[PDB]
Write a protein that binds this ligand. Structure first.
Ligand code: BGC
Length: 278
């Protein structure tokens, strides 16, 4: 129990809106040398009753060495479904649950490991909770089905120094490349982020007045086909700080005046599950 001051356990959160197909629930935290198990439940209740139906129960067991799924409804549990637990007592955990119309898709360390068919109505999930030997460090519920190629404007102030655009996506299993453009009203691309698996590199460049700039490579490429990633475009005074999965992958000196970056485009071989401005 280190610097908790965030989401203490047991954690109970009453959903403000229904959990719907296309939306993802992200839970990250830390465990200890003596953690034995922790749970994540998607459940029903009127507001705080706590104890009705549990559409989806997830038990990560360090003693058993697996992650176990099941549901509780009408006063009884069904048959558990198991998957290997890739975590050893002590490491950080990252479990994401995305709702779909026929099931829940669960990924561990951004790796899809389980498809749990709905046994009870998804619409009956009104609450969510986490408990056990885990120190929760991050919880987020949002997203939707983002079609790609994708295009949209950004809030009002857009992406300006001091702001960050976070994108959660998964390069397609058999994809070759995809890109993300941060644009200004006149169509110029301040930042072109273009991972190329065939080239084993991520190209960064700018499009000014219909002309592509220098083209910056350098950098191993921390992305993997079929594995989810967290992309952060941190706009600062002198450059874009590009973070991939928590670590800085590269810096990109501004070639265009920051501010007024109110456009976004995403294309290529990639699935997008979350977009947010912070
Ligand atoms: O115009 C040249 C540019 O074309 C783009 O389609 C490519 O992704 C860039 O790597 C290239 O520098």
């Amino acid at each position: 129990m280190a610097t908790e001051t965030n989401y203490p356990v047991p954690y109970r959160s009453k959903l403000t809106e229904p959990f719907e197909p296309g939306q993802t629930l992200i839970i990250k935290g830390k465990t200890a040398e003596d953690s034995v198990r922790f749970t994540i439940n998607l459940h029903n209740t009127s507001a705080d009753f706590s104890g009705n139906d549990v559409p989806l129960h997830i038990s990560v067991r360090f003693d058993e060495g697996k992650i176990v799924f099941n549901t509780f409804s009408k006063g009884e549990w069904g048959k558990e479904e198991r998957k290997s637990n890739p975590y050893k007592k002590g490491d950080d955990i990252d479990i994401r649950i995305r709702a779909h119309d026929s099931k829940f898709s669960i990924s561990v360390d951004q790796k899809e490991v389980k498809e749990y068919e709905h046994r009870v109505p998804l619409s009956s999930v009104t609450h969510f909770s986490v408990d056990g030997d885990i120190l929760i460090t991050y919880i987020h519920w949002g997203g939707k089905y983002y079609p790609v190629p994708y295009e949209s404007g950004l809030a009002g102030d857009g992406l300006a120094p001091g702001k960050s655009l976070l994108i959660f996506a998964t390069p397609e299993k058999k994809g070759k490349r995809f890109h993300i453009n941060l644009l200004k009203k006149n169509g110029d691309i301040a930042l072109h982020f273009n991972p190329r698996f065939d080239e084993k590199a991520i190209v960064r460049n700018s499009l000014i007045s219909g002309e592509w700039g220098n083209e910056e490579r350098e950098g191993k490429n921390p992305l993997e086909k079929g594995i989810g990633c967290d992309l952060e475009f941190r706009n600062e005074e002198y450059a874009f700080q590009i973070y991939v999965d928590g670590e800085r992958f590269a810096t990109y000196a501004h070639r265009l005046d920051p501010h007024d970056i109110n456009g976004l485009q995403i294309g290529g071989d990639v699935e997008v599950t979350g977009i947010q401005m912070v």
